[PDB]
Amino acid sequence: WIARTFYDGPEKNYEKTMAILQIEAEKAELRLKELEVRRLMRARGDGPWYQYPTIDKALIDHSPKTTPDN
Amino acid sequence: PGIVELPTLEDLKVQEVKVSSSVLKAAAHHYGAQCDKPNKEFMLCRWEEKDPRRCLE
Numbered sequence: 057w058i059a060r061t062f063y064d065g066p067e068k069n070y071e072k073t074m075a076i077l078q079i080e081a082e083k084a085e086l087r088l089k090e091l092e093v094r095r096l097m098r099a100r101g102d103g104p105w106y107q108y109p110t111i112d113k114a115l116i117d118h119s120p121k122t123t124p125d126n
Numbered sequence: 127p128g129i130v131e132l133p134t135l136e137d138l139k140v141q142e143v144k145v146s147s148s149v150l151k152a153a154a155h156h157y158g159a160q161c162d163k164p165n166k167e168f169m170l171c172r173w174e175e176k177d178p179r180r181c182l183e
């Protein structure tokens with residue numbers, strides 16, 4: 057009676073643990089990958105992250121400058 | 127890094143205009159009216175090449 061009215065079968069907890077473990081393992085591997093990706097992007101700078109500004113080239117004036125040699 | 131090439135002294139020898147700036151200013155308007163084509167050729171070449179060594183002739 058107690059088992060019927062207060063508790064559930066082993067399958068529920070078993071498969072819930074399976075799902076929880078799967079989620080947590082994915083989160084762990086995601087964290088490790090994210091750290092490695094950050095290291096690579098900060099080292100090389102070829103990614104979208106850690107992009108530091110440079111001078112905009114639309115500011116350059118391309119016109120004769122009173123002197124042939126610029 | 128590299129050697130800067132320069133024309134020889136013979137390449138820079140030319141029959142010079144040896145009149146003073148007063149004479150040049152007196153003649154300037156008619157000089158610009160008459161001698162315009164070589165002057166514009168030289169100045170277009172000078173702003174396009176951006177190099178004195180490419181404009182000597």
Ligand SMILES: CCCCCCCCCCCCCCCCC[C@@H](O)O[C@H](CO[C@H](O)CCCCCCCCCCCCCCC)COP(=O)(O)OCC[N+](C)(C)C
Pocket residue numbers: 060061062063064
């Ligand atoms: C001899 C026979 C009796 C044996 C003794 C049994 C006495 C049991 C008392 C102790 C109970 C311990 C806790 C049990 C309940 C745990 C919480 C919850 O799980 O229980 C819910 C039920 O709890 C009850 O609704 C409430 C219990 C409250 C007991 C209070 C007792 C004392 C009250 C005294 C009041 C006196 C009147 C006021 C006087 C001033 C149903 O659970 P549920 O989420 O479905 O579980 C999922 C699995 N299912 C679906 C298969 C069930």
